[PDB]
Design a protein around this ligand. Structure first.
Ligand SMILES: CC(=O)N[C@@H]1[C@@H](O)[C@H](O[C@@H]2O[C@H](CO)[C@H](O)[C@H](O[C@]3(C(=O)O)C[C@H](O)[C@@H](NC(C)=O)[C@H]([C@H](O)[C@H](O)CO)O3)[C@H]2O)[C@@H](CO)O[C@H]1O
Ligand code: SIA
Ligand code: CL
Ligand code: CL
Ligand code: CL
Ligand code: CL
Ligand code: CL
Lengths: 279, 270, 271, 279, 270
């Protein structure tokens, strides 16, 4: 997979724009329950063993594969052009919507007060790759009984192993590995990016725990992420496909009853790519 | 529009100064004006639906600045800006007559909690994307703030809790675009620069800086700043600085004004 | 004033040292009657009925000094090029055993000085330009005592003074006289001054401060010019509120610390 | 004496590994107790003197020695080639797992609410060296009776001194030194890196105390730590051994009863080494 | 006058030391009270005036003078850089001190947290100190701690709540100068470098870093480090890391030792 020179010429640079809507558990706006689109259901400890969480309570990674302009007339040549992602402008959309402290069923911060704003657990990541993101499985509790389904979601450790989790899945088990190849099917609480692979991807992420911790976010269209590695090489899109992945949990909606649901926001991407000779 | 060379000469540079007063809900000091720079009391009803009043919807400030007329032609290019939140010091006041106390015999709870800060400099209106916390929120009809129902010509659906590419607007009117409804559209705004932050929480400290030594460069990666179409410079902002906590337990958001000093140069364009 | 070249010669550079003591409300230590509360306010409380009629002891104000510089005289002016500045006495805030300190819980230590912080300093060749803006326009500040928006306008504040009112302007020409809660630096003026500040609200928010004698602030603008001292006077201004003293009864007073300055100045030709 | 970097073909090599946390329950393989793998047991003040902590409540450092390819045919020569560690990409794995706020026995934040997220005390460090990490002993309370090493306990200050601790071990006792040469046997609360030694190691660490303090962690495969010193020399691997140490405490699991247990996450390393001539 | 840096074979030396914290119980070698070494006694507002704090409740600065090899227009050692580290940070993960107050019933102990104070100084003479106290009516013990009364020879007046030019001392004795009374004097200390911070609050997270890759450069703006008068290097510090919370509700401040490795070079001076 030898990288040669950057292609020179007129249309050697292109731009790819897209947005990814969050997949928090209620993943569709088009259902007769869709009122909770971009939210989970109510998150509660069961109180007895074992936990059997519902799919609505399992926020999942967003992913899209973007098809790119075909570059090579004869694909049997050793030396071909490939799209190389060199930079990205990315932004969490709808941040301002979180100033709303008057949702009708918001728990009031104290008697007669404004609602507790969306706050608490945050998880924020994005990835740009020339192939699916590689995932490592690890869970808080190996005894958790994740939903078994027939329609390909959610995919968890039991799904990939073809057998029950054992205690080692609370740590790093090299067999618990997957590719982020489907939108809204790989739960955040089960899968993280695999740092031992992903040579052809760049990812950036953070978590914030706490129950009412401030959600603190910036947005600016002046911010650019360079996607080049130390050798000056960005992700190379094999099969003329650009993989874009993300997750943006922005906190809890505090309901009057005391119930709490996690909330997510969409993410925008503008990826600059260039043509690169490879061998 | 292809960008040519920067113009050289004696009157090549100019500086535009302005301030923008906050539009929190009570938007005029010349009327109920006692609550100017504040909302009314923000309070989840406990029952459905939510029908917020106009006084409870903080909105973006905006001004179009007419620039000296110039005229393949010359356009004004915004190259840098000094901007500052004005009146930050007023927030040390912990003795508002009706301020809720931190405890018995204590000082008032200081303005703190939800902050939202943004400013934009552009050569056309700021492009907005609509997204709401709850699509069932019934905003007042435009007679009146502009919201998603106004632009769509029909009610919101669940998709307006996410990114609906139809929910788009332009920031063309001062005090009319609710902050909780509209955010800068990153898919557009090629000819504007915007910078913003949010801080959620109820008594989360308000932490702000001020200095006249701080400059924001508005040039893009190619060395080109926003280009002022029809000789109009668009200046937009929002500066929510937290809640005024009242004795009863009621709470209102508060805003502060923003000052701008924009440096512009003449630029040949085709 | 057109700025020419930096003067060359043996004694073209001078250094100015000073400290400013905080003006928190009880502004003097020399009153045998009430100076125990020097560097603090009195007890800050919401009145519970309208209007607020705050006392002078509850209005922290800016510190100011004009420093006389050597007479030089198209003429020469002193140009401030850098400053080393420090909040003095930061270590005193480890004391959690003030005799009347509200305890964190039963048998525990005192609540340390914490909560509202406001820190700013300014160096200029003339008084700092101030913009007026208050939380509540119906506040009835003491008559001139402190100089407030009502003082400069010669009439009662109106709602517009809760936002930016271009008539609500003053110069910081008097020590301990301009209430911090009324006045902020005017960013529309102050071309011949450099100012830096911040605020932190919240009731018990940690007071977090640094101090080092290795930190210099460069005062030159984007054109390599520092403030130029009109009539050979250097103006230094600051405020350093460091949080609340929490008292047993529930009462709370604001506290401030002093600030030190070492300003480096050079001679500059101007026209 | 350090001489010149070796110029040649296979002059650079990469070493990949992960270390699973040793929080107290250190094996996933034990017949009965292993469900608490990556956790401590319940942490409690005894209420009477002295503290007599159990193994399971004493998080320890992770460590591995990695065998490097043999470089010298003749080991008698004055001048030899050694592996020199020059950079490392390291990442805490499984960070996303901490969004789980529905552990079956999770203490709620309030009635009907979600579980208190894993939060509070954090401790994070990693070290890359050419020899075992040098340790310095210091404890909160010198009267603490750690389980005896001979009884199958961890190695602590008493172990190294051959006698009981005295009040001076609440400060810096220059005789309370050890080397990190054993996985999950040196307690974090007893041993910190020794700054008076470790010339042939690079270490980086932080603590965060408080009970429900947000756990704030980042992850990216774009972040590289440079291991070179001020003279441009990285750790030199004695006996062809690369020493890799870490500790990643990420907070408390809050249980319904009020009981609390600390939790850790695994850490991944990718160390780049080059060949170096040494006299 | 500072001349040229000495060139030659043995011109650079390294000085290594550590300093144990002087929180109040200053010695590990006492009959029955050393169990609290590196801590204060219990800190408690009396509820009546005046405060009469005990020496066990007054954390003080650590200081050492290191003798450097003799050299003698003369040569002097010049401190050019330091690696410094707070040792024992990992010990603070212990949430099971036998008498630790719980966060809630059945819970773990409240971790060491709250007030932090961190400072270090390297110089060629003793650090210059400025006196300032929260409460000038505080009755400190006589000499033993050295406080403002000791140095003035008369009672503190209200001015000592601010900056009193007469309230000055030199940090010449280990564990004798209370932190709550003395801070580094910025009006002197030309021949020292000092770096410090405070963090207030009762349960504020203790957030500390440690790494053997961090170096502080000690040279001033002219490239000159502290010059060691009479071949003596002065090293001073303080590291309060927060409170130990006891079951009863009582609280003690706690400190940690600090390590130093100073690089010095020979410098010609007239
Ligand atoms: C059956 C009965 O009533 N017995 C009591 C016995 O409990 C008591 O001992 C004291 O009990 C209290 C209970 O809150 C504390 O546990 C005392 O311990 C501490 C404290 O936390 O207050 C421990 C702390 O470390 C000590 N501080 C220092 C600096 O050493 C303090 C301190 O010495 C005391 O508060 C005195 O200032 O004590 C514990 O001593 C005894 C003795 O009072 O009386 C029996 O009748
Ligand atoms: C500014 C000041 O001196 N405040 C003091 C007040 C007032 O003397 C009286 O309340 C009269 O208003 O009295 C206290 O006992 C109190 O209530 O806590 C102590 C406090 O320091
Ligand atoms: Cl995050
Ligand atoms: Cl913000
Ligand atoms: Cl501040
Ligand atoms: Cl940490
Ligand atoms: Cl600190």
């Amino acid at each position: 997979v030898e990288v040669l020179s950057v292609v020179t010429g007129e249309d050697s640079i292109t731009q790819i724009e897209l947005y990814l809507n969050p997949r928090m558990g209620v993943n569709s706006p088009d259902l007769p329950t869709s009122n909770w689109y971009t939210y989970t259901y109510d998150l509660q400890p069961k109180g007895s063993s074992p936990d059997q969480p519902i799919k609505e309570n399992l926020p999942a990674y967003s992913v899209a594969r973007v098809s790119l302009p075909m570059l090579n007339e004869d694909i049997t040549c050793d030396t071909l052009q490939m799209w190389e992602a060199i930079s990205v402008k990315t932004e969490v959309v709808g941040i301002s919507s979180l100033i709303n402290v008057h949702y009708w069923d918001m728990k009031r911060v104290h008697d007669y007060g404004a609602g507790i704003p969306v706050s608490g657990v945050n998880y924020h990541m994005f990835a740009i790759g020339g192939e699916p993101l590689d995932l490592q499985g690890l869970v808080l509790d190996y005894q958790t009984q994740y939903p078994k389904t027939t329609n390909g979601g959610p995919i968890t450790i039991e799904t990939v192993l073809g057998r029950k989790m054992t205690p080692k899945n609370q740590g790093l088990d090299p067999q618990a590995k997957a590719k982020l190849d489907k939108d809204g099917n790989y739960p955040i609480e089960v899968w993280c990016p695999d740092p031992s692979k992903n040579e052809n991807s760049r990812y950036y992420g953070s978590i914030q725990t706490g129950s009412q911790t401030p959600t603190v976010l910036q947005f600016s269209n002046t911010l650019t992420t360079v996607l080049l590695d130390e050798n000056g090489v960005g992700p190379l899109c094999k099969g003329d496909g650009l993989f874009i992945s993300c997750a943006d949990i922005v906190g809890f909606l505090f309901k009057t009853s005391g119930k709490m649901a996690l909330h997510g926001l969409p993410r925008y991407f503008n990826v600059t790519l260039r043509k690169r000779w490879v061998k």
